[PDB]
C-alpha cells in the first residue's frame, strides 16, 4: 500500500527513460512552402490537392 | 458462400411441397426399429420453420392422450417418405409459440 523505502535519484531517472515526447510527421507543402502534417490541410494556404 | 453451395447441392430434394406455419401435415417417417423397415405416421400442426440451405428445419405439434408432443425434423432428411398438406390455417406471425400454453377451443386455429 504505502512505500516502504524512498526512491533514489538513480532509480527515478531509469523509470523515466521511455517518458518521452513524439516528433510529428511534417513535410514541406508543395504550394504553401511552410511545414505541414501529412494528410492534413495546410494552415498557411488552405490547399490539399488530393 | 459459393464453395459450400456446390458441395451440398447433391443433397437437396424436389419432392417437397410448400407449407406455411399453422398448416396441418401428415408426415410419413421410415422406422427400422425391430427387424427391418416399417413406416409410422405423425399428424400435427406446424409451429416453427428455421431457415438455411441443407440445414433448414421444421417443428410439428400433436396432443396425444392429453399430453402434447413436438417433433423437429431436418427438411432434407432421407427418412421421410411423404408429406401431405390437409388443412391451411390463417395466422398473424411466423412462430406460434403461444400454442403450448393453450388447450381446447382456445388452441384450435381458423381455416382460410
Amino acid at each position: 500500500a504505502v512505500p516502504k523505502r524512498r526512491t533514489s535519484k538513480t532509480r527515478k531517472n531509469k523509470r523515466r527513460t521511455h517518458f518521452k515526447i513524439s516528433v510529428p510527421g511534417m513535410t514541406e507543402c508543395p504550394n504553401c512552402g511552410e511545414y505541414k502534417l501529412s494528410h492534413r490541410v495546410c494552415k498557411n494556404c488552405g490547399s490539399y490537392n488530393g | 458462400h459459393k464453395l459450400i453451395e456446390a458441395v451440398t447441392k447433391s443433397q437437396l430434394r424436389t419432392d417437397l411441397p410448400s407449407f406455411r406455419p399453422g398448416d396441418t401435415l401428415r408426415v410419413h417417417v421410415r422406422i427400422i426399429e425391430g427387424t427391418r423397415e416399417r413406416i409410422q405416421v405423425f399428424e400435427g400442426v406446424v409451429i416453427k420453420r428455421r431457415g438455411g440451405g441443407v440445414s433448414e428445419t421444421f417443428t410439428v405439434r400433436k396432443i396425444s392422450s392429453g399430453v402434447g408432443v413436438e417433433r423437429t425434423f431436418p427438411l432434407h432428411t432421407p427418412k421421410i417418405e411423404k408429406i401431405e398438406v390437409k388443412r391451411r390455417g390463417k395466422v398473424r406471425r411466423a412462430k406460434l409459440y403461444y400454442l403450448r400454453s393453450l388447450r381446447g377451443k382456445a388452441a384450435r386455429i381458423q381455416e382460410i
Binding site: - | 396425444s64 392422450s65 392429453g66 399430453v67 408432443v69 413436438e70 423437429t72 425434423f73 431436418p74 432428411t77
Partner: protein, 121 residues
C-alpha cells in the same frame, strides 16, 4: 428426474401419484438423468387404496421429459411434462396399466414390458 430435488409425475397405475428424486444411479458424481435411466425417489402423494403407501423409497425409470431426446437422424422429440414408473428390481413394472405416450429409447434399454402396455410409443 434430472437433478436431486426434481419432482416427477407417476404415469403407471398404482397408489403413487408424485415422487421426489433422491439420487441418480450410475458413476460417482453423476449430475443429471434423461429418458432410459433408473433413479431413486420417495413418494409424497398417493391414493388411499394404492399399493405404494406415502413415504416409501423405491426405484423408477424415466419415460417422458421436457428436455427431449436427440436421434442419430438429426430429429428431436420433446414432451410437456416429466413422468416415470415405479419399477421392480428386475426391470418389471409394479402396476397393470400405463398412461400417456412413451419414448422408443426404452426399447434399447430392454424395458420390453413397459412398451407393450403403453397406448402410444
Amino acid at each position: 428426474m434430472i437433478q436431486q430435488e426434481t419432482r416427477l409425475k407417476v404415469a403407471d397405475n398404482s397408489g403413487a401419484r408424485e415422487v421426489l428424486t433422491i439420487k441418480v444411479l450410475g458413476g460417482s458424481g453423476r449430475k443429471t438423468a434423461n429418458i432410459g435411466d433408473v433413479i431413486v425417489c420417495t413418494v409424497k402423494n398417493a391414493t388411499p387404496g394404492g399399493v405404494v403407501k406415502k413415504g416409501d423409497v423405491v426405484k423408477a425409470v424415466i419415460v417422458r421429459t421436457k428436455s427431449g431426446v436427440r436421434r442419430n437422424d438429426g430429429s428431436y422429440i420433446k414432451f410437456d411434462e416429466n413422468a416415470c414408473v415405479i419399477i421392480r428390481d428386475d426391470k418389471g413394472p409394479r402396476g397393470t396399466r400405463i398412461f400417456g405416450p412413451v419414448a422408443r429409447e426404452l426399447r434399447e434399454g430392454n424395458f420390453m414390458k413397459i412398451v407393450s402396455l403403453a397406448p402410444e410409443v
